[PDB]
């Protein structure tokens, strides 16, 4: 069974990593690029970018542990713990060469530790629409004069006594449409049909819980990154952020400059959080061009 | 059928104010003190303070519009709109002399405009455990190094699509116990029976919605207060805040200093948000003494 349709010429497969069965979709030939999705979604957010990248790269798009068709992690949900699974997965397909990494939302949280601890394995890095977990997240406001706070869900999802699962169970499709559209500029791309697909996946009880455990581990991830950030990232890095409703604007590049020696950033006007879907043409072009500098 | 038991010597009654039928509980004799409850609760949070105050004052404790047994407002849920109802209700019982005001949580939001606009009507003022809506609320962090913050509910409750009503329906008792205890230092004061009573009250569909409409109007209340705050408050004021988990600490008095010329403050160590219940005896003492000077 497949939760989302595989693009023509790709395969849906699984790989056991440290006792955890990870789902991924893979296609193409050449150097490896791994695309890592975020909260509320799965590998499928990349399905329009994947065929274009596969003309020059081997492309792998895993489901995060516990999400999509991937089993939950056995160690835990902190960034350093999850990053082990993703690093070992990528290295099974690229054991002797560095690979490229593209990550969105909590995909950033779940990859930053393995990037900084295995810098020689990462050729080029693209991060979009999430803060790297650090002390800056403790200053983001809970309530805004205009629009809506992009970050209050951190506390909702991290609340104890399984508050979020208890309130959202049975209402997953309603909740997902609300939080996707509230973080979007171009809401019209989220058709009822596409929302149905995403909601069906994260309504699996272990996936609903897994989704929130990433936030329950956020303070631990911050503590982990306080140590890791003592070494700046050396590989070429690109940041993308939306400039519209739900977009992080200039914050994405400004924070990355504290982490990376070689970084360029873009703010995409009229685009919110969900860049691959809201602004597919400019986002895909930016990613393909950036990764195509060099061997592919 | 009363939602909460009325103390001896008090009456549960109703008055029509601008076409809205307000519920209140009233007892005592002497100058008027109005006690205004906050989110998650009703007049009943004052039921231990009321008989003590009723020894020296006429005491009235209304249900906020749409909450408890009060009808929803017919104008709106912004602080300036709701404060009209509470001002006119108090004036029905104290038309000829100023009255005292005690408010908790969003009771503050719903009374500050009528205090600043009718200062000759307010003898003494007691505010506990809520910011006056102003630009300071836009700095409160969403997330803390210990986990969930005390303020993320601002955005949960203000969200559209009836987000809060839709997620909380069928889980009202569960959710109320959660936010009571996440804002409490002393949870042992909340019996299963008391949580049952509060949950049954705000689970009424129009009351669950009314609860969150106060937050959907919060930015409008901030904008309203930006003009009202040009006039400082002159009456004697006291602030109270908890010093424990759920408490606002020094924020309550420090904010009030920008609004009030004559203000004293206390922070109650070992107490959280729900001061009339978590720390009833010292809270009551401080309110009674402050109002009884003279
Ligand atoms: C994924 C968010 C996706 C869906 C939310 C239900 C991650 O949980 C968060 C990624 C990005 C948004 C968080 C940080 C915003 C960063 C700084 C800008 C602050 C503005 C503000 O409104 O506070
Ligand atoms: C009622 C809260 C009741 C139940 C919560 C579901 C009001 O909605 C909020 C009133 C008080 C609690 C929130 C405000 C805290 C204010 C500042 C604390 C200081 C933090 C800081 O950043 O300085």
Q: How far apart are the first and last CA of chain B?
A: 39
Nearest Cα to B256, choosing from B268, B248, B246? B248
Alpha carbon distances (Å) from A81 to A137, A211, A218, A246: 20, 15, 12, 28
Crossing angle, helix A205-216 and helix A192-202, to 10 degrees? 80
CA angle B75, B252, B188 (to 5 degrees): 90
For residue A55, give the nearest of A294, A293, A292 by alpha carbon.
Answer: A292
Residue located nearest, by CA, to atom 10 of ligand 1:
A130
Residue-range domain boundaries for chain A: 9-292
Running DSSP on this structure, what letter comes out for residue B147?
E
Q: Which helix (H) or strand (E) holds B258?
A: helix B251-259
Among all chains, which residue has been given the structure tokens 């997330």? B143
Q: If DSSP codes are grouped into helix, strand and coil, which group holds residue B267?
A: strand
**Smallest CA–CA distance from A150 into chain B, residue:** B142
Q: How far apart are CA A263 and CA B126, in angstroms?
A: 54
Give me the half-sphere count of Cα atoms (radius 13 Å) on the Cβ side of residue A214: 26
Q: Is A195 on the interface with B (CB under 8 A)?
A: no
d(CA B54, CA A139): 45
B231 close to A (CB below 8 A): no
**DSSP conformational letter for A206:** H
Contacts of B128 (CB under 8 A, 6+ apart): B102, B103, B104, B239, B240, B241, B252, B275, B283
Beta strands B143-144 and A263-268, pairing class: unpaired
Strands B99-104 and B32-36: parallel
Do residues A105 and A35 make contact, with C-beta atoms less than 8 angstroms apart? no
CA separation for the pair B273, B241 (Å, rounded): 7
- CB of A124 within 8 A of CB of A235? yes
How many Å apart are CA A295 and CA A274, to the nearest integer? 29
Sheet hosting strand A58-62, strand order edge to edge: A11-17, A20-28, A58-62, A32-36, A99-104, A122-128, A237-242, A263-268
Q: What b/e sequence results for A135-148 when a residue is b if at least 16 CB atoms lie within 10 Å of its CB, and e otherwise? A: eebbebbbbbeeeb
Q: Is B160 exposed, middle or buried (0-12, 13-18, 19+ CB in 10 A)?
A: exposed
Q: B187 CB near a chain A CB, below 8 Å?
A: no
Distance from C-alpha of A76 to C-alpha of B89, rounded to nearest angstrom: 56
Cross-chain residue pair B154–A142, CB shorter than 8 Å: yes
Residue given tokens 């690029």 in the structure block = A33
Structure token pair of residue B71: 């009808």
What the block records as the tokens of B211 is 């609860």
CA A223 – CA A214 distance, rounded (Å) = 14
- Chosen for mutation from B146, B149, B152 (greatest number of chain A CBs closer than 10 Å) is B152
**Considering only alpha carbons, which residue of chain B is nearest residue A141?**
B141
Structural fold of domain A9-292 = Rossmann fold (3.40.50)
Report whether B272 contacts B184 (CB < 8 A).
yes
Parallel, antiparallel, or unpaired for β B32-36 and B58-62? parallel
Q: Which residue from A143, A218, A219 is facing B140, i.e. has the nearest CB?
A: A143
How many CA atoms are closer than 13 Å to the CA of A220, on its beta-carbon side? 14
8 Å CB contact between B25 and B19: no
Annotate A235-258 with b (16+ C-beta within 10 A) or e (fewer). bbbbbbbbbbbbbbeebbbebbee
Does the distance separating the beta carbons of A156 and B156 come in below 8 Å? Answer: yes
CA A67 to chain centre: 12
Angle at A125 between CA A122 and CA A131, to 5 degrees: 125
Measured distance CA(B227)–CA(A146) in Å, rounded = 18
Only one residue has tokens 């940041």, namely A239
Q: Residues A130, A109: contact at Cβ < 8 Å?
A: yes
Q: Is A106 helix (H, G, I), strand (E, B) or coil?
A: helix
What was the structure determination method? X-ray
Partners of A267 in the beta sheet?
Answer: A241
Q: Find, among B99, B100, B67, B97, the residue nearest to B82 by Cα.
A: B67
CA distances from B180 to A162, B37, B192, B245 (A): 15, 14, 12, 11
- Which of these, A30, A228, A227, A234, lies nearest to A120 by C-alpha position? A234
Counting every residue, how long is chain B? Answer: 294
- What are the residues facing B126 on neighbouring strands? B102, B238
CA distance B267 to A74: 45
Tell if the CB–CB gap between B143 and A163 is shorter than 8 Å.
Answer: no
């Amino acid at each position: 069974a497949e939760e989302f349709p595989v693009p023509n010429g790709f395969e849906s497969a699984y790989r056991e990593v440290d006792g955890v069965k990870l789902h991924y979709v893979k296609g193409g030939q050449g150097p490896l690029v791994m695309l890592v999705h975020g909260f509320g979604q799965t590998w499928y957010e990349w399905h329009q970018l994947m065929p274009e990248l596969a003309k020059r790269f081997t492309v792998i798009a895993p489901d995060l542990p516990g999400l999509g068709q991937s089993e939950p992690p056995k160690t835990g949900y902190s960034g350093e713990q999850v990053a082990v699974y993703l690093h070992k997965l990528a290295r099974q397909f690229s054991p002797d060469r560095p690979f490229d990494l593209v990550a969105h939302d909590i995909g950033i949280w779940n990859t930053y530790p393995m990037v900084v601890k295995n810098q020689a394995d990462i050729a080029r890095l693209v991060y979009m629409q999430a803060p790297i977990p650090d002390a800056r997240i403790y200053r983001f406001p809970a309530f805004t004069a205009q629009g809506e706070s992009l970050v209050w869900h951190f506390s909702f999802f991290a609340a104890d006594d399984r508050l979020a699962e208890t309130l959202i169970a049975g209402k997953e499709r309603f909740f997902l449409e609300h939080f996707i559209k509230s973080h979007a500029s171009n809401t019209e791309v989220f058709s009822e049909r596409l929302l149905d697909l995403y909601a069906r996946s994260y309504a699996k009880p272990h996936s609903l819980n897994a989704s929130f455990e990433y936030y329950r581990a956020l303070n631990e991830s911050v503590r982990q990154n306080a140590e890791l950030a003592k070494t700046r990232l050396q590989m070429p890095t690109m940041t993308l952020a939306g400039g519209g409703h739900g977009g992080m604007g200039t914050f994405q590049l400004e924070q990355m400059k504290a982490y990376a020696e070689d970084v360029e950033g873009h703010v995409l006007p009229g685009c919110g959080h969900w860049l691959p879907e809201e602004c597919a043409a400019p986002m895909n072009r930016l990613v393909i061009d950036f990764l195509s500098r060099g061997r592919h």
